[model samples]
Target: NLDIIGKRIEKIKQEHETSWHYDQDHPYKTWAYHGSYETKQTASSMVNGVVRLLTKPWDIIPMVTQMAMTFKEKVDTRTQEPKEGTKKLMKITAEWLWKELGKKKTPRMCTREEFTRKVRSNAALGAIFNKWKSAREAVEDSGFWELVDKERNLHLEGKCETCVYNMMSRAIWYMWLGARFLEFEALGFLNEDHWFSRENSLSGVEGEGLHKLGYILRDVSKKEGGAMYADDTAGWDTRITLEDLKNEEMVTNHMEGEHKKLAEAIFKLTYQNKVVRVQRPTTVMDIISRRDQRGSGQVVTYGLNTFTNMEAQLIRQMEGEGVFKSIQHLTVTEEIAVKNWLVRVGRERLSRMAISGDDCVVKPLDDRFASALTALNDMGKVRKDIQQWEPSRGWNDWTQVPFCSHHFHELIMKDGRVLVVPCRNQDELIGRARISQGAGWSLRETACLGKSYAQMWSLMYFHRRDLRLAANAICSAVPSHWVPTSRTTTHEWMTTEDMLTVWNRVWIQENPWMEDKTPVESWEEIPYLGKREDQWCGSLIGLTSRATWAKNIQTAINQVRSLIGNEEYTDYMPSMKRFRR
Candidate 1:
């Protein structure tokens, strides 16, 4: 055993070595799964659309040859091939960038140009001004064309050219068609070759993608209500079948073997792009329902049996963040070590949105310290070693308080009494679904006196203290993606309306265009900030003690302006004007 397995693998790699800058307190470790500001303006407007299409390559070589001729991959249906391995890695890097586009020319431009000729050496008018001004500012710095002209009139009101959520659309591959290279890293040179630069560039990345979202998070965790572990999904599928969904009408093929391996690399980019094929027309779900309320999030989404799947007595997956590894090591190998480790994770995500603000819109890095008073002084030393093992109490026998949900608990609703809810996982039941809709039960089914009580009920018992829990609250405004870093001064609103009436009779359901038949003491006006997060309250704290969440959203806008009365919206399509074709 060569020096005894190199002395137990160098004593477990220097006992799991770490320089300890998990990228500046990583949004205080994903402030409950996803911090926002529209997720840092979605990777800061796609890193200024990958430094304006890699400086400029003939305006991103015809949108990188129709995203490497529709480069999504997956195969082996009775040996058609490619299940992994470089599979023509973007067809030999776009056939030597179309054989170096006819060596860019200029073997003769003499007499036609003399006197120190230098109008930026006009290399053929910078290729027609970088092919139509850098392919319209790199697909308009990929903020995906204002939802691509409003989902092309929402796929023309109801004509969705076959939608299987158009392979996770951005108006079906954002202003184009079937594409990849992770939507061609939305216009940033991943025309990868120069074998993904290092001693030169990746210029702090803007390509590939977090392992193409780590293979869509391991094929949605080996299927079945697409998992959410702690196991027991009724022995993983019992009922639910029409031979397992999508009894077709259009999807001639739901994204065919990654679009028939992008129609076999559009015959190695010989050129011309119709973008492979396979229609979808969007008719999802033949079963497993419950997420409906008029066009889900309107802005044009029509269909037949829209969106579906999830059952094994639903509420399946929980407590996870996995990669599931090896799909032949995700089609093998890296480009200059995955482009300088994705430009060191885009400089620790612009130094974690460069500490909240100022520096002219995100500028707080000097190599990571992302302080919020050192993560509330390391969450007050993990709340002082969880108040030292418990001692000062004997109200119910001895010292035993550590239940904090490891998985699956119960369904109790009698005369409100519990300290049993205790959770640290299961996405803190999504900020306890607005305190489980309005508390028929609270404190997460009661009983979490420790283990940092659900990270101290997501930092200081998540806000909003009074005003009759916004009279069956849903929200009239506050949806700037709940920035909440920390601070929550006494928001007991009767334990958040008995934890949203035990979460509106179990896990907040009634939103058929919001139906609870007006009750929370007959609504006295509302909309005092909805869609809140970080488990329903601020998390780390800053900007002057997070101004108690802007004074609990200006005291729910002065208690919905002391019960509204000046009613005057008068626009029931009053001779509506704005029009088009």
Candidate 2:
């Protein structure tokens, strides 16, 4: 195919290489002139060959082809070329770069050296900087330190990690050890029995020590409560201790001897620096519970025990078959449990705060703050309870949060009202949280002069709207890795239609001439998107669109997989045939 393109290009090049210069817009002066003398049938065959070569499978290779075909028509329209063959002869050659096929090396450099100097040199901030530096160095000698720090950075600063909910979701993973990659097949082993138990009976556990550390941090933030306690404590406070930690035997069991030395060293620096001692240690469950329990002004026990046994069974079955792996692939049982806990806790937390005139430090002490907090809290409760709550009763009792309108997706609240939510994937949800937290705020705002809580909320919807579009760009740039299964436990947030919409956007932009082309409305409407090429070539549009969409989306998925240190799973492109045909 390359040779074919080369020959055609070389022949065209030889003819036009020495041609006299003329008006840039005229076909006689353009690269298209090389083939301008050929007939439409002749030019069309060559153009078709170009298309086939570019779109070849094994080689596998949209509008760009149509754009190529119509380039001569465009020239004819511009120039009064009554000579038909002259205009038809020219075809878009391989010389034209339709898109960058290769991943260009993104220039990156570490500023840690510079960062170290600045922090150490600073007069006021330098003291703290030295402490942070020393802390990094304390664990720098250990590979496990690298692992833990990498995990923290991945959770805190990586893509979508800034989102409050997503951040808390990750905090859940760290706070309670999720199964590790090597132990991925034993996801069922992450049962609450092993976690909340006083001892670490489960051996070969990878995340137990880290989970214990996070749990201890949370415990230090508590006033007086076990897992059942839901009231708001000072987010963090002064003078904490090692005894503040949870799962004493489990944490000790995992972190003893070699692990204990590392854990002790890491915490001592943090303790000495006073960074580990703070006002409040908040969790997703804590925030959710606080919000929901706002008006009640007391903590209430949620029946977390309700579905534990059944959930344990489901996880056992899934893990038995080696179905689950990454947290991204969490089963429906797990997702609902997380969701329900968030609602049960977050709603109460918000309510408790609202009743007591308490708010996130960033929020103003006013009706505006109260109203926004209440509304968001109420919405979360209703959203999950109506749309996601029943799934806890049975794994299969689930539904996709429906598209509410052209611009928004929604959750149907219990009162039959709908709240507009982020229309994109979980990443967008994280972006929303970042925006809400004033992440995009100007430095002036950070200088303690920022928009009021209500003012921030006022601008959030538009920010999220643009962010959703940005999310689409990221989705289109990455490859699709989601696999469809008949089992209701799969944790995919975006559907094939959502993915196709992203591809359509990319296509529209790449081939501007095809701008007016009708986009795919839904995946079901485009039957050919899932059709195997070995089966048949149904239509050029279907073949090119679906093929390119699949390839691009898969590329995007792989890119993200690499980003998240999950390269092992990057090769697994979900077979489209697995879905309903």
Candidate 3:
């Protein structure tokens, strides 16, 4: 009965009863999936727009108001089911905040001395200034204006007012004629009381319960507000309608200071500017896509659709350290185990561009192989006894080698053949792989044999005065006649001759408008060395080493977790016992 469950449970509780500081090395653990603003706006726009088609605008705002309350409970947090205890959580929090403000102000200020004194004492005015400072900075720093200007032109070209993609846009709700919260007062449906009156200051058990229930309700409420929209009209209005302002047809960019200022005013009235809703015409995908091509070639037309879902920063680090020149494409198959991808470009070229004259070989991380290492180090199920097993033959034969990957694991090369070797679950294996890979030392090169082998690890035992097989496994990893593969689709391949023509028509030929005007240039040729190459290269080593070390720590944590007697382990054992349904 005591899988030592009580003790292990106690240990788990003792070690991590409370939230701990997030280990930046293991970003995946702490990283919360923040859903887009698109969901909230789209759903609001959808319900309001749809309801408006069937009902009046004033009637629909209440439904929208209800949906907003319910939606926030679930998607905002990872908790799938809303907490039932805090039914009126939002109302309570809002009320508490407003009540707290009363204490900070002078009692006489409420009975203001005309408009002049009122303007000076206005809490909202003071609040708006502070909020505006940060908002303006964000707008300028992020090039928010540029994006809006660009999108306006793009919408014009695409005629995307009714485009499916616009359903995820925030601008649509801002542009919509109805669903205007400000218009409620104008229509006499609401008054000053409607703006300031408290709906329900939810607190205590009921409030908490509502919070949990709301989360579940939100998950099922697929009307228009989820991760992606199913309906078209639920999102931002991508439509750039040309109006006759006077006589000539004038197309509004909507990106100007006008809309941004307008949105701020609305937020000030409704939410009291505590949380300003600046219509960021930009999207998340756009930020990521630009980042993906940060240092990529100008001629290379990989915006978003072309590149694979891997870390561009990681690739840059590799390139900086003389890993590769341009490792544009990478692929890994499950059958071939281990971590990420491994791609090697020209050594001399990569090295010459390195911060130092010293030779630095560039390489990609093997994510696929990382999985195998993780599997080996999973202590709970794999067991420590198996983890301790070290095969002299150095093969990753999980069947025979026991927990070869259980502890400090290594995807090693014994005789030009790959093996998953086990070691003391310490920091040695990671450093060993790096050093071996860095020096291009294959198994045969590192072997007792005094001479070089022709084949890697001497797999082909061709014995002669001159034997290429005698070379170590590291050298063998690099194919003698490796060539980059073409990623051209059928259409691209057919139109290869006119590729430049098609590309130029779609995009600006050169960014002469940029501060440094080189039409096409590599990082090495870029005018400013913002950070010395030495510093950048040093950073690469630091980042890579830390990343590897983090992997080791994570491996140990898994081993400790559910160690037999631990309640977590005991809890899981029952599931292991039952057959699949």
Local distance difference test, per candidate?
0.21, 0.23, 0.20
TM-scores for every candidate against the unseen true structure: 0.19, 0.20, 0.13
Please give the TM-score that candidate 2 achieves against the real structure: 0.20
True-vs-predicted CA distance for residue 109, candidate 2, Å? 29
Q: What are the candidates' C-alpha RMSDs?
A: 27.4, 30.9, 33.3
Candidate whose lDDT is highest: 2
Candidate 1 error regions (>4 Å): 1-499, 502-504, 507-556, 559-581
Candidate order by decreasing lDDT = 2, 1, 3
lDDT computed for candidate 1: 0.21
In candidate 1, what are the lDDT values of residues 1-581, reduced to their tens digit? 12212332233234334411122222121011111111111001111121112112212234322332211121100111222322222222223222222133111111112211322232111111212343224343445344343433433232222111111201122223212111222111112222122111211111212112112222222232211211111111111122112111112122243332332222112111111112222311110011111111110111111111110101001001111122133333443433333234432322211010000011112212111111111111111222422221211211111211221112122322211122232223222322211123222122111111222232222222221222112122211121211111112221322333433322224322223444232111211222232224322223333334333533433343234323221111111121111
Give the Cα RMSD of candidate 1. 27.4
After superposition, the stretches of candidate 3 with alpha carbons farther than 4 Å from their true spots are: 1-81, 88-91, 101-172, 178-581
Per-residue error (Å), model 1, residue 539: 2.6
lDDT at 54, model 2: 18
Worst window of 10 by summed lDDT in candidate 1: 311-320
Residue range 1-581, candidate 3, lDDT tens digits: 12212232233234443522322332122112111232122221112121111112122233223432322121111212112211122122223322322223211211112212323332111111112243224233335334434433433332211101111111111211111211221211112112111121111011111112222122222222111101111111111011101000001111134333332222222111111122123322110000000111111111110111011112232333433222222223311210112223222112211010011111112222212222111111121223323311222221122111222112212222222221221122111121211133333233211111212112111111011111211122222222211111111112212222322221124211123322322111112111232133122223454344323432323332312113221111111112111
Off by over 4 Å in 2: 1-250, 264-581
Question: By the lDDT metric, which is better: model 2 or model 3?
Answer: 2
